[PDB]
Amino acid sequence: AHKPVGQNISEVRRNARLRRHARLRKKVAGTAEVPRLVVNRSARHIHVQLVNDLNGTTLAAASSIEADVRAIDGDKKAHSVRVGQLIAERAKAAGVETVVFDRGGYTYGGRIAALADAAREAGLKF
Amino acid sequence: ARNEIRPIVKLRSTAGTGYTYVTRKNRRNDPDRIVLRKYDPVLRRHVEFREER
Amino acid sequence: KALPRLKQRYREEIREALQQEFNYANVMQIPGVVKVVVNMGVGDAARDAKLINGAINDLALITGQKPEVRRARKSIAQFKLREGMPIGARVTLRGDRMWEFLDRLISIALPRIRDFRGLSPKQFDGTGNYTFGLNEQSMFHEIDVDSIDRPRGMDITVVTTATNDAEGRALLRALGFPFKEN
């Protein structure tokens, strides 16, 4: 009949993330010719989407789970870089050149920033 | 209102090589008068003024 | 490539003993100290704004980290207290530095208190967080005990992921706090 007392930091970190993400989202918008680039991070891997918030739909996608992206050897950062490459290619196939960048409730720098900078290098306008 | 020596005092903000007096009303019980300041003059561009009364 | 005394001891014996006492399903339920807390209320902020610096220097010499200066968010004028008057210093301790601090405290100073019969088992709260207090800083050999101009006591409080006072007292016993065994 052991019982806990209160908040774990997992809950804290989670709900704080959602808090600041839906803070940030006030200024970011969505559209099929200017969609939103959402990123959703974990310690291990990462996920990203291109979102149209006019209909809450999705146009592209990518993540560091796919074996073809695990075929990278280098750091987490390099996984993220190749992810940015894949999403640039896919976005510019499905017909999107310009986007915004939603950091999804995370700080800019590290894996997020290296992703985004690789994408800016490889053609996306932001 | 009047011209008393009010806490909110002083005026004139003149420009170097830029003659476009920009004005502002400020206090004078605080220390400073030889730093900061900036604005757009005539024919010129974003450059630095004095608070010169 | 290093281990403090109390932490090696913690990972060797104490976790085992608490397991054999309370029989948890997951070992994640095991109690573990998180942090250690230090505070000093100057209180004469409106009469000596310099004892604050004195206390800062003492806690610096004591804990090896520059403290935080806690401001007064409310203004209660029956004490002269006004919004922003520094009343006290505060320090947080976490990790190897914490374990070293507990080693020093248990092994140098608390065996230097005058007529130390025992720290109560009743400084806990809700689940086992031990909040005691020191009158003087005339005890840490860390301190230069020649230069002190006044007593500047302090207040310590020790927080743990323990869920009740029984587990708290048992853990702190295994770790070697001189409770009054009763």
Next chain:
Amino acid sequence: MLIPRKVKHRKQHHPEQRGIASGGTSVSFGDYGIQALEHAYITNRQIESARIAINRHIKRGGKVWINIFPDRPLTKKPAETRMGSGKGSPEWWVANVKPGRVLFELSYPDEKTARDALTRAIHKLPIKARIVTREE
């Protein structure tokens, strides 16, 4: 005497005398009650007179509840002053009383003495009223 210890706004409009009761249309705490029928403003002194009328008619033991409190003032202004120049000061305190509303509730055993007492307290008030039993 009945007054409040403090009101926020010590100069109020006159209460309304329009409509029937919403609450206090049901005896609550005693056995033998008083019920109004008209609209009226009932003051402090009236209720004092009435409770004394009741206690001097039972005289020993039996309880009296007053479901009203004068929490709305009225403003007289001093004498022989031309109209205008402000609003007078509060001097006496009323409670509004809409028809259907219950004022007093007695608890004394014998209905004879109780009904008589309530009648003596009715004849100290400006309103037509009647007497109530808790029953349907």
Next chain:
Amino acid sequence: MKPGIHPDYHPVVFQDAATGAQFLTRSTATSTRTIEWPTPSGPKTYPLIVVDVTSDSHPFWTGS
């Protein structure tokens, strides 16, 4: 931890002057607060501090 420097951090050997049951461990106590005799108790050498009194020389719940 960070610049706006703290006190300095070096090891320490608290030599039991009571009965010779000494201690030795990393600490934030050093130039700041240390004693001479760099006595290696281990594979390395680091400062020492005479311990006038301690646990095994202080009658109490842990000591008689």
Next chain:
Amino acid sequence: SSSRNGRDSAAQRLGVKRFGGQVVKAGEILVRQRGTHFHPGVNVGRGGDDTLFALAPGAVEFGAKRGRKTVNIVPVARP
């Protein structure tokens, strides 16, 4: 023997000015207001005095977005 009261402040003509259904041009003023009783939605902007105005022509829709009454603008159908 004085009434020290008597003052008052002239109006400010607040409230809604273009209700549901109407056709509004750009930059037109839907509501004047002190606080954000009504918040902006889509194709709507805020002022300095918490006035609202239109950013895109169309027609109104006073709907709510998470408990707060909004104002919106929708596309008219081109003739």
Next chain:
RNA sequence: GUUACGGCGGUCCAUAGCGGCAGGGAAACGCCCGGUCCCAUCCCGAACCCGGAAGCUAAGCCUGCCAGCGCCGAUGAUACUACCCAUCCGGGUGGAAAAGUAGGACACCGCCGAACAC
């Protein structure tokens, strides 16, 4: 297509919440190990950040259960009211609450991704 999966969103935003019970960890969500490198604390690698996967589903989270703390909520009647009749009173045609009741409800919906498969 599909399962007790994850993520982004919506509802004129609690019918969606809080609390209690049981139960799950394949890939994922996580917690955790440690501060070498970017980077950070009004002090603290606690947080943010970095590098990994020893350990555990205990907690977070997801699933079912409990209508209990909260919410939603009608029909009909009443109050009030527009108009009209009416010598005070009151009344007729239409509109119609709040509360209360019966009840409901341990949410619903959309997209991509996984895992699973013909």
Next chain:
RNA sequence: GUGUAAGUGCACAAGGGAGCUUGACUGCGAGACGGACAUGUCGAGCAGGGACGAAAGUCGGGACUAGUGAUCCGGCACCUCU
């Protein structure tokens, strides 16, 4: 709690805190409110030249409404007007 009265709003923070900093700019302004009249209020968007930010984007004073006084007559600086 919001600098200062009250209200309307603010936890999605406009509350609290830290780093840079001067947009407390210049040239304009569609369409509108309110409207005896003069006054008064907001204003997207364009241009130079900038701040901040990784970018998107925000900045033409302050959470909003009060904080001041028409016209005439003179005063100071600048103008490629007489």
